[PDB]
Amino acid sequence: SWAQSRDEQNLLQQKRIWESPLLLAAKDNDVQALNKLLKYEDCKVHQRGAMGETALHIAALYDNLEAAMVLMEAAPELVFEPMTSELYEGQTALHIAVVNQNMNLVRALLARRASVSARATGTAFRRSPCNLIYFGEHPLSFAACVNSEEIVRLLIEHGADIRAQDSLGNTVLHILILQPNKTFACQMYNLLLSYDRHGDHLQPLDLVPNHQGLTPFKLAGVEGNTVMFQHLMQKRKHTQWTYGPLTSTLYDLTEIDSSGDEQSLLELIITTKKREARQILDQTPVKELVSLKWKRYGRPYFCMLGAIYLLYIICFTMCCIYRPLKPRTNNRTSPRDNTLLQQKLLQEAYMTPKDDIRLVGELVTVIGAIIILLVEVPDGPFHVLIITYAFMVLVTMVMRLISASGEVVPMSFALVLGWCNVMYFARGFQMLGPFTIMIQKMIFGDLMRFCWLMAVVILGFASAFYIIFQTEDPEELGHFYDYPMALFSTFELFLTIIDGPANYNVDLPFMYSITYAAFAIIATLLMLNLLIAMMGDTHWRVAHERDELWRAQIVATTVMLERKLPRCLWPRSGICGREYGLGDRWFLRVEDRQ
Amino acid sequence: SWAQSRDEQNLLQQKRIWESPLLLAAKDNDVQALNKLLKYEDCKVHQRGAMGETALHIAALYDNLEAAMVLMEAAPELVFEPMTSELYEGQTALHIAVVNQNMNLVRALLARRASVSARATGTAFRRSPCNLIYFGEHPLSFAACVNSEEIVRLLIEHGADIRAQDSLGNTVLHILILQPNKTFACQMYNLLLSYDRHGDHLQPLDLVPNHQGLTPFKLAGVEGNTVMFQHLMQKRKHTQWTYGPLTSTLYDLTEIDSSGDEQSLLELIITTKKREARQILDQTPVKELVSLKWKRYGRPYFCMLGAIYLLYIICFTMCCIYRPLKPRTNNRTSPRDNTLLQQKLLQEAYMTPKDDIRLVGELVTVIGAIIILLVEVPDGPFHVLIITYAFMVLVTMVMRLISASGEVVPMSFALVLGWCNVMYFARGFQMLGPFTIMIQKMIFGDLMRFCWLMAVVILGFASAFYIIFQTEDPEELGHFYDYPMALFSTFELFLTIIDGPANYNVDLPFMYSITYAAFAIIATLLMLNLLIAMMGDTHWRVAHERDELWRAQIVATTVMLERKLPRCLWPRSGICGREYGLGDRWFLRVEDRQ
Ligand SMILES: CCCCCCCC/C=C\CCCCCCCC(=O)O[C@@H](COC(=O)CCCCCCCCCCCCCCC)COP(=O)([O-])OCC[N+](C)(C)C
Ligand SMILES: CCCCCCCC/C=C\CCCCCCCC(=O)O[C@@H](COC(=O)CCCCCCCCCCCCCCC)COP(=O)([O-])OCC[N+](C)(C)C
Ligand SMILES: CCCCCCCC/C=C\CCCCCCCC(=O)O[C@@H](COC(=O)CCCCCCCCCCCCCCC)COP(=O)([O-])OCC[N+](C)(C)C
Ligand SMILES: CCCCCCCC/C=C\CCCCCCCC(=O)O[C@@H](COC(=O)CCCCCCCCCCCCCCC)COP(=O)([O-])OCC[N+](C)(C)C
Ligand SMILES: CC(C)CCC[C@@H](C)[C@H]1CC[C@@H]2[C@H]3CC=C4C[C@H](OC(=O)CCC(=O)O)CC[C@]4(C)[C@@H]3CC[C@@]21C
Ligand SMILES: CC(C)CCC[C@@H](C)[C@H]1CC[C@@H]2[C@H]3CC=C4C[C@H](OC(=O)CCC(=O)O)CC[C@]4(C)[C@@H]3CC[C@@]21C
Ligand SMILES: CC(C)CCC[C@@H](C)[C@H]1CC[C@@H]2[C@H]3CC=C4C[C@H](OC(=O)CCC(=O)O)CC[C@]4(C)[C@@H]3CC[C@@]21C
Ligand SMILES: CC(C)CCC[C@@H](C)[C@H]1CC[C@@H]2[C@H]3CC=C4C[C@H](OC(=O)CCC(=O)O)CC[C@]4(C)[C@@H]3CC[C@@]21C
Ligand SMILES: CC(C)CCC[C@@H](C)[C@H]1CC[C@@H]2[C@H]3CC=C4C[C@H](OC(=O)CCC(=O)O)CC[C@]4(C)[C@@H]3CC[C@@]21C
Ligand SMILES: [Ca+2]
Ligand SMILES: [Ca+2]
């Protein structure tokens, strides 16, 4: 399909080199083969192939200085060449010898008036996961990424705009953050900003956003580039006083903190898929800012929401304890029919003043449900449950207003959805927070992978056991009446949570006692203690990084509280300017000791 | 509040520097800006701000030699300056340039008759956890802590008392033990004691106590400073003979052992909150002294107390086995009323001579209870239980003397409080001692953190299950009658200590079998084996450091036995002086091999 075609275009490129001898001698520099063909007939000086390549392209792509130079006097009208077939579209040979770091050949290109503007918008230059280089779309963006100091100075002299944006809006400082060698990215970064000693009006190149709106300070935090992040912090510092080993220092907090309706750096670190971005979250202004927001305004508001939710769940719980039951009207259709009670009706529900006090609690309940949805629906996993909990009150609101069957099951959902959301509020404690991360990674990581192997062993053995108690007396190790019940027995004999079956009274069915021994060795010993050994590794894995998993829970919570509460209750953190003479910016003081 | 105000006072300091140009040019040395203002109008030569700072202070705090010297001829009447607003109170600039290690500027201060006496009693110099330096309150105490060898010699020449005590009584040798760099603390320590070649009367500076009474030998043991501790031991040694690889050595034991009613070093290491202090407990005189006290007098007395307590608990146990029961008077109020017996009365209790022998045992019991309280109340966790055990005998003493209901429950406390105090006496064995440390750290470390998450899952599911068996026949998986009993069922289905419920006889309630499968995956597999993986780490953690946890149990026990037993049964450990000609001190011989 796609990658098949891309490999075909590589060898069909290899074919048309071997077709034309001018294209062939461009690869291996046979100057004899070159200057024979040039002193001959015209012989297709700009004939293209599948990709749009030329002989000057191939001599550059296979590192031929001499074969290219002889071709230059032969045809100087070429050099402005857009290699263009949908995947290489825009690329020049002046792109090529820069990526190959060929300083002699790009000198001859800039001698013949090369184009340091050319936008390589071909799909092998997009920022995609299927293209394992992203160097930009410009020669100066190419020269920067490959650590090519000489050429970088050379290109700008010939008119290479340091400010030019590619088809994602990224400047060359945005592209240097995306490079995998984080240390060599730093040195080429300063060389481009040094040359921006001109042009300080309109965001002097280290404030210019892309189409996403991010600056190179905020993009280093989103991409997790901590080395570039600690570099750019030094511009946003201010040493204040150095009394011995003490040191006071102000941090800038204009792009780190919530400037306005813009997405702050703490919002973008939480709302990203990249895992390395959460190592920004303990750097020297950020860790102090989160601790200041949590200890002074985040933890008091979170504990008061945790207490109001705890009373509301009791005010839910006590109403569904006292739910309208009555003795039944009809009688037993079977001896197995074994209810002794029945749901009451709304007409005869609220008769006493005792029940008048009850419906207060249920009106506290239902009003709480529409408050939840009006908060949440106009927008992690506890978001899903609290929407499901509000849904389950408004289900059994509807079912009682038309007085129908099965109130219990929408409530049977509701309690465990309701009370396990108190475990949400366990993140407000250092020593209880990452316990819920353990619970998740065991379910979605260890249960949901091994569960398929457990259920295969169930349906194997539970069918195997149900043909042994089908032709028997169903009260006498009646652990198997039904393929439903046999899936309920073997689920609870795998786990050893009910008794391993035996009756020891009657002449027992034979093949069973062979079979349950086969079962109990492989289920209750081998595959149950597989899972216990699995989840023991998950516990060890999450308890190891337990501090940094809790800190990411606090940043997620503090951002969530700050956006939704009104500004008159969440004061802006830090010390304001304009009275201490620093600017209108909002700073933060940190004092340390070395 | 507090730290908010402290940061405001740092930037308001930064404001009033930027207000007055004399204060501004004190920071960055603009001598031009200085000598313009000085050849002008008087212009407030000693105007203060919020903190009481001066221009000579700011030039010293921001390291200006030249700006300070020009200011000295301008106003030589300053230098005696008490910077004084409640938090900086007492501090001189002569304090400041010493902490900044500015040897040229303090030369010009001592040229202009500086004050090496000044007591920086401001709250930013107290020994508090919120001030992360404690260098003392004096310039010589400052110069010592910052490792400033040159200035330390210089100050004493200008009359810096090495013996001066700050507002906690600590001398400079006390303050050098509190410094975090333990190796550089040692070298500056000797330089101050070398200069105490004068003044040997009245405790020659290495015996002088603070207001707590501690010497620098005993303070190094309380603070856990093992490097300073092994240093000061060398003064308290005596090599005795060196026969080949053998070596005999006497240790001093005047401050290590219990000199009298004073608090010995072994008492202060146990009664401290610092954790590093228990690494003193295996140094070369201390480890031999504890082993000598334990093997010769501690372990015999502890095993005899462990045997007398074991007989007393049997003498408690057998009486509350034979407790006054009789057949009941009334009859069954319900079929569920199912006692077949009743408490007897004190009148008809002691009728036979068999019961006369019983009350002997109970008088052994009660006398044992008031002995415990008369021992203990006029003063760790086994202290709390043995006071609670003595309380529970004297509860059921009172209840029988007025012949009332419920003897059993104060006794039901009493047994498990009584017999688990035998586990106290497991510290008298090397291989049984730190088992009780495991039991504590699992309860207060692993249970009491995760218990909140277990109970949340209980009330979630046990409410969820109790609405499924409310409208049923309560004898048929009657594991749920009551929200009390449902909290008792789900506590014992979480733990899988009772059978996972099933009846398999009647048409079963439907939503239950969905729900218990939801429950048994998350309770009996996921969250129960969370705790087993948690407490397995606690076991590994305590069994790793199991020798040094047992040795701290012995020091705690030996000190406790020695204080309470009379002196005529606990002889003073070691070899006395005054007959072997060493002094009146009590020494200890150790023989080793290298
Ligand atoms: C990890 C997730 C695992 C999910 C599955 C775990 C189980 C959850 C499944 C279902 C959840 C609950 C729904 C009930 C469905 C069963 C219907 C039933 O029992 O009816 C009948 C049986 O009929 C059957 O046996 C149907 C089952 C076919 C074999 C299993 C395939 C389904 C899953 C496999 C997919 C492979 C996935 C695994 C590998 C990829 C009942 O018969 P009876 O009334 O007793 O008749 C008496 C006979 N007499 C009349 C002669 C006297
Ligand atoms: C994980 C592995 C664990 C083992 C699990 C087994 C794995 C496979 C093992 C063995 C596979 C072979 C199974 C043959 C079964 C047919 C025999 C028969 O019909 O029984 C007859 C009984 O008479 C007997 O009991 C004779 C003995 C048969 C089994 C011999 C020991 C097998 C295990 C040796 C050691 C194992 C070596 C393990 C390797 C270390 C008939 O029974 P009945 O009572 O007369 O009446 C029946 C009436 N009914 C039909 C209505 C009910
Ligand atoms: C780690 C420590 C955990 C502590 C809690 C663990 C549990 C220990 C708690 C208590 C210990 C024992 C005391 C008994 C109290 C219950 C009273 C009761 O059952 O009465 C009644 C119910 O009423 C209730 O349901 C009250 C419980 C409200 C919800 C739970 C809140 C309390 C704990 C949560 C605090 C959050 C802390 C967790 C997160 C921060 C009994 O009802 P009935 O008689 O069957 O009536 C039949 C109805 N009929 C009349 C229609 C027929
Ligand atoms: C940790 C997770 C473990 C799973 C736990 C479950 C989690 C959530 C799962 C599912 C949520 C949805 C629940 C819907 C229940 C309502 C249906 C109903 O009313 O039943 C009817 C029965 O008729 C049936 O049995 C129809 C089948 C319903 C369930 C289908 C399989 C669900 C699990 C698929 C596989 C799971 C996939 C798991 C992912 C790998 C009514 O019953 P009745 O007998 O006719 O009479 C009732 C009388 N009574 C009211 C007095 C009692
Ligand atoms: C009816 C009376 C008693 C008024 C009180 C009702 C409260 C019980 C509810 C109403 C809506 C509120 C909620 C509003 C929305 C939020 C979402 C929040 O969602 C998450 O769990 C974040 C998910 C994640 O990050 O993993 C948790 C509950 C919270 C703070 C609130 C919890 C409690 C509140 C105050
Ligand atoms: C009543 C019957 C029909 C089923 C009810 C069981 C499940 C639907 C619920 C109830 C309790 C569980 C929850 C309990 C707690 C966890 C932690 C987890 O929290 C996190 O996301 C960790 C990261 C963070 O907190 O930020 C999210 C939900 C999860 C897996 C669970 C999701 C689903 C579970 C199995
Ligand atoms: C009535 C007749 C049988 C006389 C014998 C009574 C003994 C059973 C009791 C009386 C009070 C004594 C106690 C006195 C006080 C101490 C406190 C000691 O406290 C602790 O557990 C230390 C706590 C800790 O360091 O963690 C334990 C028991 C002990 C030695 C004694 C145990 C046994 C004694 C001899
Ligand atoms: C009868 C019912 C109502 C409750 C009785 C149970 C608890 C009150 C007691 C009985 C046994 C336990 C104790 C058993 C032994 C441990 C070891 C622990 O010993 C230590 O302090 C270790 C350090 C040292 O020994 O010096 C202190 C008490 C502890 C946790 C326990 C404290 C409380 C427990 C749970
Ligand atoms: C073995 C564990 C740790 C997890 C492995 C896979 C589970 C995801 C599967 C295995 C088979 C189970 C099923 C087994 C049979 C039941 C019957 C249930 O409804 C009924 O038919 C019985 C209701 C009644 O008896 O009235 C629906 C699905 C359920 C809980 C199960 C759903 C999920 C389970 C736990
Ligand atoms: Ca059982
Ligand atoms: Ca069992």
Residue numbers in the entry:
A (entry chain C), B (entry chain D): 28 to 406, 423 to 637
Copy text verbatim from the article accompanying this structure deposition.
In a nutshell, hTRPV6 is assembled of four subunits and contains a transmembrane domain (TMD) with a central ion channel pore and an intracellular skirt that is mostly built of ankyrin repeat domains connected by the three-stranded β-sheets, N-terminal helices, and C-terminal hooks. The TMD is composed of six transmembrane helices S1–S6 and a re-entrant pore loop (P-loop) between S5 and S6. As in all representatives of the tetrameric ion channel family, the ion-conducting pore of TRPV6 has two narrow regions, the selectivity filter formed by the extended regions of the P-loop and the gate formed by the S6 bundle crossing, separated by the central cavity in the middle.
In hTRPV6Open, the pore is wide open and its narrow region is lined by residues N572 and I575. This conformation is the same as in the previously published open-state structures of TRPV6, independent of whether they had C-terminus truncated or not and whether the protein was purified in different types of detergents, nanodiscs or amphipols, strongly supporting our initial assignment of hTRPV6Open to the open conducting state. When binding to the open TRPV6 channel perpendicularly to the central pore axis, genistein molecules pull one diagonal pair of subunits (A/C) asymmetrically towards the channel center. This motion breaks the interactions between D489 in S5 and T581 in S6 as well as Q473 in the S4–S5 linker and R589 in the TRP helix, which stabilize the energetically unfavorable α-to-π transition in S6 and the open-pore conformation, respectively. TRPV6 is a constitutively open ion channel.
